[PDB]
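Operator note (shift B, R.M.): manual run for Major prion protein requested after the automated queue skipped it. Running by hand, logging everything below so the morning shift can see what happened. Input copied straight from the record, untouched. If output looks odd, do not overwrite the archive copy; leave it for review.
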Amino acid sequence: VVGGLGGYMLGSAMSRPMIHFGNDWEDRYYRENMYRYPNQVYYRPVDQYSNQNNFVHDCVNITIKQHTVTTTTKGENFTETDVKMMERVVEQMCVTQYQKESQAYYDGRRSS
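Run finished. Output pasted below as returned.
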């Protein structure tokens, strides 16, 4: 049961999303430190989606939780600064995974 998710869709991996905090040093900090954050994110299928926002936040919390729990259990943690930078990344990755799978649905009417 994916360690203890009940059954969140663990997505596949990614490459560096284009986070733009509005700052300069944050973007550079992120670009040096991006390895500290996961490749992949946890969510539900578009088959039972309803809300973007509520689904996004619940993913964001649950992948934040897992990095801050299923790594912190051993001895692996972050800072408020890394954590907020993670909230950006976890969102962009979560958003992208929904967008990938739901666009496959919304594009999936072009037998043209």
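Quick read of the result: The chain has one domain: 1-112. Residues 80-107 form the longest helix (28 residues).
Leaving this for review. - R.M.
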